[PDB]
Specification:
By secondary structure, this protein is α/β, with parallel strands linked by helices. It contains 8 helices and 8 strands; from the N terminus they run βααβββαβααβαβαβα. Strands 1, 2, 3, 4, 5, 6, 7 and 8 form an 8-stranded mixed β-sheet that branches. The chain is globular and about 40 Å long. Bound molecules: guanosine-5'-diphosphate and magnesium ion. It is found in: Nucleus; Nucleus envelope; Cytoplasm, Cytosol; Cytoplasm. It comes from Homo sapiens. One of its GO terms (molecular function) is G protein activity.
C-alpha cells in the first residue's frame, strides 16, 4: 500500500478535527494511538496512478497547551498547518507551528490552510496571507463545514510526494454532507483575491 503519515497541526479551535472528519470512511476507520493522544484517520484517495492513503494524525486537543511531543511528529511525510480566517492570532502562530515541523521533520511537503471561509465576517483576507510565499509553501482557503476545497491540499501533497505534477484524483471520496452552504460567488471572489495577491 502507498501510504503517508500526515500531521495536521495549528492552534486549538482552527477546525482540524472538523476538517479531517469530512472523509467519512476515514472517520469510520480511525485508529486510536492512545500512547500519543492521537486518532489516525485513513483518508484514501484514488488517483490516476492508483490509490493513496494519507494517515492523518489528529490531536486529542493537547495543542491548546503547547508544542506536541516528538512522537507526534516523528516520521511524518507531509503536513497541513491550519489557521482560522476569523482569528488573527491563529494566523499569527503559523510560523511557530512551522518551526516545530522543520525542527522534528525531514523537510516534508507542507500545505497551509486557512479554514472557516464560510463565516461572513472574515478577518484574515488574502492580502495578509503571505507566510507561504516566504517559504514557497502552497496555500488554500478551505471551509471544513462545507467541504469547500477539501480535496485541494491532498491533491497538492500527492503531486509532491509521488513527484508527478500531472497526478489527478479519478473520483472524489465520500464526504460528510455540507453543514453550511459556501456561497459559490463568495468562493470565486476569494479565489480571485488570492490571485490578485
Ligand atoms: N463555520 C465553521 N465552523 C467551523 C469550521 N471548522 C470548524 N468549525 C468550528 O470551530 C470549532 C473548533 O473546531 P475543531 O474541529 O474542534 O478544531 P480543532 O481544535 O482545530 O480540532 C468547532 O466549534 C467547529 O464546529 C468551518 O469550516 N466553518
Ligand atoms: Mg481537534
Amino acid at each position: 500500500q502507498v501510504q503517508f503519515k500526515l500531521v495536521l497541526v495549528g492552534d486549538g479551535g482552527t477546525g482540524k478535527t472538523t476538517f479531517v472528519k469530512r472523509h467519512l470512511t476515514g472517520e469510520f476507520e480511525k485508529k486510536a494511538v492512545a500512547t500519543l493522544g492521537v486518532e489516525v484517520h485513513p483518508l484514501v484517495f484514488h488517483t490516476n496512478r492508483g490509490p493513496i492513503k494519507f494517515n492523518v494524525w489528529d490531536t486529542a486537543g493537547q495543542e491548546k497547551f503547547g508544542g506536541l511531543r516528538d512522537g507526534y511528529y516523528i516520521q511524518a511525510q507531509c503536513a497541513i498547518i491550519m489557521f482560522d480566517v476569523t482569528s488573527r492570532v491563529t494566523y499569527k502562530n503559523v510560523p511557530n507551528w512551522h518551526r516545530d515541523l522543520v525542527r522534528v521533520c525531514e523537510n516534508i511537503p507542507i500545505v497551509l490552510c486557512g479554514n472557516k471561509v464560510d463565516i461572513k465576517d472574515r478577518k484574515v483576507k488574502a492580502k495578509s496571507i503571505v507566510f507561504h510565499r516566504k517559504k514557497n509553501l502552497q496555500y488554500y482557503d478551505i471551509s471544513a463545514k462545507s467541504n469547500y476545497n477539501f480535496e485541494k491540499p491532498f491533491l497538492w501533497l500527492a503531486r509532491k510526494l509521488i513527484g508527478d505534477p500531472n497526478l489527478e484524483f479519478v473520483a472524489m471520496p465520500a464526504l460528510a454532507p455540507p453543514e453550511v452552504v459556501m456561497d459559490p460567488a463568495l468562493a470565486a471572489q476569494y479565489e480571485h483575491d488570492l490571485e490578485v495577491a
